[PDB]
DNA sequence: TGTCCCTTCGCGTCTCT
DNA sequence: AGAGACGCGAAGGGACA
């Protein structure tokens, strides 16, 4: 395509064509996306050994296949799989799903490699479980992590005591190096000096990027107290909470702003940027606020609620643009798009909603005001596309009213409890003799899928604290509070 | 042009009261 | 109920060969 090489351009495309070819079945998108972050020795190599990884010992999927090679050294890693999945499955019992995880990251070749050869003395002599092995090299960088958990792990448990937990959750992360390092030496400091409990400092430590965010903490603390009269309390939320460096240097340049000019209070201004790409929120809502309390647009609170989550940018923009679209075509108030909008997935969410609400009510017959309701959650747009797809097999292969269908989707994770009650609604109700509306009320809750995940393993294999309760008591406590509630009673 | 490592950001799901 | 934690991963940048 570009410039350097010249004529095996048709080497390129016959290839391209041979993936959509009978091992694979590779669909344009995904092509792309290998070509795109793996590059062209990624979708040659693919082709290279595509037999060899789909049969053999390995029997990859084709989308794992993809999952590994759409990274920066694909290649390498797809080669390094070959090489090391069986050893790393046989001699160190891992999961393939586990090895696959590892190689798909950037430096793939890396991570697997130095699993292979630190698994042991991780494992071993310092006693971590290899899930937490796997935990901290299924990212970029693994390689760095792993080796700087070894070296530190020691010192960091004994002369800073903290938990080898409190380790992983630090090096689990990419640059894990960079912050396990950077807490070493800022440890003493931040706690001593700007005093601060070690369980925040690892809080900071425990996001990508942690190394900028203590160092930034560590500079920035006093000022933010001193000068914008911030609670320490208040300045480790926005340094944990995603914000990192980014934010709490955007809140130092846009604090005095956003209070004397646009008149929004810290506590505000603080929970804005409690949430990643603070500063892209902040800076959303520097400009977009007048517009969006002008052309008529909403309340300040209302403006603050929709930025207050992760994608605020995402979010505020999606918001002033369909604002009008929404509310004048559809018939929509404003309060409906904000509520639709105050979430994660905003933009996503209100971008579903303008291409689905006609379809939803013309085809499937809904309100719109359950569309609404199935939109203002977390994950609104895979809702509203799921009900799509189960709501027509959910009413006849089923039998449920729509209604029922509604209120299981009107749930963050409505998507996977919806999907989770058409796999297992017919097991439950003839193999275990529950009733429609008990699996339908498991479901309309939070975790409405691992509630019946969980609801299912204990009838079907009665696990160890057994009888004693009833079907029926199950299936109140799992609606009370689902997964938690119920392993919390095994616990007794 | 590939490989490796680091940081920022956005989407989705679950739980803790 | 809404806030907060957790998991997953795209995208962008830097360093070096």
Known sequence: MQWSGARALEALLTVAGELRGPPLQLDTGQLLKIAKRGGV??????????????????????????????????????????????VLCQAHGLTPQQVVAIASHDGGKQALETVQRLLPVLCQAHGL??????????????????????????????????????????????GGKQALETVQRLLPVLCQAHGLTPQQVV??????????????????LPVLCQAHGLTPQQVVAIASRGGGKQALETVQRLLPVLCQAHGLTPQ????IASNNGGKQALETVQRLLPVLC??????????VAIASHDGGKQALETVQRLLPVLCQAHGLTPQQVVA??????????????????????????????????????????????????????????????????????????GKQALETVQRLLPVLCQAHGLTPQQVVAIASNGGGR???????????????????????HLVALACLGGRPALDAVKKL
């Open 129 to 174: 479980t290899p899930e937490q092995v796997v935990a901290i090299a299924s990212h970029d960088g693994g390689k760095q992590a792993l080796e700087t958990v070894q070296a530190l792990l020691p010192v960091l448990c004994q002369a800073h005591g903290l938990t080898p937990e409190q380790v992983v959750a630090i090096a689990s992360n990419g």
């Open 450 to 472: 691992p509630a019946l995940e969980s609801i299912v393993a204990q009838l079907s294999r009665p696990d160890p604290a057994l009888a004693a309760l009833t079907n029926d």
């Open 294 to 303: 002008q052309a008529h647009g909403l309340t300040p609170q209302q403006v």
């Open 41 to 86: 020795t990624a979708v040659e190599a693919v082709h290279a050994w595509r037999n060899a990884l789909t049969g053999a010992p390995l029997n990859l999927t084709p989308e794992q296949v993809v999952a590994i090679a759409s990274h920066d050294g694909g290649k390498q890693a797809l080669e390094t799989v070959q090489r090391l999945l069986p």
């Open 340 to 413: 639709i909008a105050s979430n994660n997935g905003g933009k996503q969410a209100l971008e579903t909603v303008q291409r689905l609400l006609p379809v939803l009510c013309q085809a499937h017959g809904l309100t719109p005001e359950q569309v609404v309701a199935i939109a203002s959650n977390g994950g609104g747009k895979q809702a509203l596309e799921t009900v799509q797809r189960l709501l027509p097999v959910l009413c006849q292969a089923h039998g449920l009213t729509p209604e029922q269908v509604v209120a299981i989707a009107s749930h963050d994770g």
């Open 203 to 220: 809080a900071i430590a425990s996001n990508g990027g942690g190394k900028q965010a203590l160092e930034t903490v560590q500079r920035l």
């Open 268 to 271: 505000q201004v603080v929970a």
